[PDB]
Amino acid sequence: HHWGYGKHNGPEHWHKDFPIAKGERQSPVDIDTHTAKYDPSLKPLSVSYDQATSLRILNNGHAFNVEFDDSQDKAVLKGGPLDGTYRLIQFHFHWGSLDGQGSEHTVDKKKYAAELHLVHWNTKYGDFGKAVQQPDGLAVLGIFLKVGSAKPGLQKVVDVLDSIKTKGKSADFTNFDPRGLLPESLDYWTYPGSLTTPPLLECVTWIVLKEPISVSSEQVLKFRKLNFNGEGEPEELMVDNWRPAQPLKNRQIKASF
Ligand SMILES: Nc1cc(Cl)c(S(N)(=O)=O)cc1S(N)(=O)=O
Ligand SMILES: [Zn+2]
Numbered sequence: 001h002h003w004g005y006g007k008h009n010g011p012e013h014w015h016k017d018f019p020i021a022k023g024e025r026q027s028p029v030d031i032d033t034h035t036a037k038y039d040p041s042l043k044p045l046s047v048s049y050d051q052a053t054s055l056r057i058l059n060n061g062h063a064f065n066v067e068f069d070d071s072q073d074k075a076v077l078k079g080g081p082l083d084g085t086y087r088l089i090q091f092h093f094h095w096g097s098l099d100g101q102g103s104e105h106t107v108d109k110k111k112y113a114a115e116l117h118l119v120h121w122n123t124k125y126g127d128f129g130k131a132v133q134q135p136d137g138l139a140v141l142g143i144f145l146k147v148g149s150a151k152p153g154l155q156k157v158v159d160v161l162d163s164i165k166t167k168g169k170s171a172d173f174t175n176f177d178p179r180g181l182l183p184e185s186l187d188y189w190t191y192p193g194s195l196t197t198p199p200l201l202e203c204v205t206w207i208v209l210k211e212p213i214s215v216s217s218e219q220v221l222k223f224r225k226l227n228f229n230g231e232g233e234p235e236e237l238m239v240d241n242w243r244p245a246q247p248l249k250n251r252q253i254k255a256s257f
Contacts, residue, residue: 002061003017003018003197003198004061004062004228005062005228005240005241005242011243011244014198014200017198018198018199018200020194020199020200020201020202021198021200023194023200023202024202024249024250025192025193025194025202025249025251026193026194026200026202026246026247027104027105027193027194027195027196027204027206027243027246028103028104028105028106028193028196028206028243028244028245028246029105029191029193029245029246029247029248029251029253030105030106030107030108030109030245030248031105031106031107031108031189031208031253032108032253033107033108033255034108035253036189036253036254036255037252037253037254037255038254038255038256038257039081039254039255039256042080042081042190042254042256043079043080044079044080044186045077045079045080045186045188045207045256046076046077046078046079046080047077047141047182047186048075048076048077048078049075049088049177049178049179050179051074051075052068052074052075052088052177052178052179053068053069053074053075053174053175054066054067054068054069054173054174054175054176054178055067055068055069055172055173055174056170056171056172056173056174057157057160057164057170057171057173058164058169058170059164059165059166059167059168059169059170059226059227059238060167061167061168061228061230062197062228062238062241063092063093063094063238063241064092064093064161064164064226065090065091065092066090066091066092066157066173066176066178067089067090067173068088068089068090070087070088070089070121070128073085073087073123074087074088075087075088075120075178076088076120077118077120077139077141077207080188080190080207080256081190081205081207081254082139082205082207083136084122084123084124085122085123086120086121086122086123086138086139087120087121087123088118088119088120088178089119089120089121089128090119091116091117091118091119091178091181092116092117092119093114093115093116093117093145093223094114094115094117094196094241094242094243095113095114095115095145095220095223095224095239095240095241095242096111096113096114096239096240096242097224097237097239097240099113099147099217099220100113101113101240101242102114102115102145102220102240102242103115103144103145103242104142104196104242104243104244104245105142105144105206105208105245106245107144107210112144112145112146112212113145113146113147113215113220114144114145114215114220114223115142115143115144115145115242116142116143116144116145116181116213117140117141117142117143117196118140118141118143118178118181119138119140120138120139120140120141121137121138121139122134122136122137122138122139125137131203132195132199132201132203133201133203134203135192135202135203136203136205137203137204138195138203138204138205139204139205139206139207140204140205140206140207141207141208141209142206142207142208142209143181143182143183143208143209143212143213144208144209144212144213145212145213145214145215145220146212146213146214146215147214147215147216147217147220148214148215148216149214149216150214150215150216150218150219151180151181151213151214151215151216151219152180153177153179153180153181154180154181154215154219155219156176157176158219158222158223160173161222161223161225161226162225164226165225165226165227165231166227166229166230166231166233167227167228167229167230167231168230168231169231181213182213183209183211183212183213184211185209185210185211186209186256187209187210187211187255187256187257188207188208188209188210188255188256188257189207189208189210189253189254189255189256190205190206190207190208190253190254190256191206191251191252191253191254192204192205192206192251193205193206193251196242196243197243210257223238224237224238224239225237226238228241
């Protein structure tokens with residue numbers, strides 16, 4: 001009875017195996033644009049993905065991860081609310097069964113069709129495993145996806161999904177440039193949170209971009225063709241793999257604009 005997004009193993013059940021699910025800094029959260037405060041102390045956000053080197057893509061049973069070689073100082077996120085440098089390790093998405101839902105963070109309660117998460121770990125902790133055990137171990141750059149014009153830079157990801165339809169399947173995925181998934185503006189909201197999937201560790205500094213990227217209906221439809229189940233098992237379409245907004249509690253969301 002592994003965790004998932006179904007009625008019997010979904011978000012409302014996670015607290016049993018992962019008590020921190022009801023913690024003080026859980027993610028995602030609803031971003032109230034009028035309550036968020038502009039913070040002039042925020043330094044410019046720096047996204048340096050020029051030397052990013054992807055290794056492959058994997059269907060982990062709940063979504064898919066595009067993994068990067070993080071053994072060297074490449075693909076770094078810094079500046080903004082961050083102290084030091086965070087290295088890119090992987091990115092994945094959360095999406096819905098319908099265009100009207102799919103994102104984890106919401107803006108004034110608005111749900112986007114999907115949400116992209118570029119995960120980075122604080123280099124002062126040596127690696128990802130040690131980083132997640134620290135309050136400032138990770139920095140996740142979140143980007144909303146809305147349905148409209150196609151996103152050319154996402155097509156290579158979309159076309160490879162056919163080869164990893166079921167849980168456990170992976171495929172070589174090199175030379176993918178994550179810069180093609182970024183919107184024009186780097187304006188963002190930031191707050192201290194957690195992983196949105198079990199183990200739900202509260203080790204994340206969230207940086208959510210205000211500007212969404214547009215992807216075509218055809219592109220997101222292919223995301224929905226993936227399977228939660230493994231090869232040869234009853235088909236369970238991989239959709240609605242998003243956790244709903246959690247209590248903000250004692251936290252303030254800061255705006256870079
Ligand atoms: N490993 C991992 C790390 C982070 Cl930080 C996040 S998220 N959703 O908090 O960005 C999700 C995952 S997972 N289990 O989906 O691969
Ligand atoms: Zn995520």
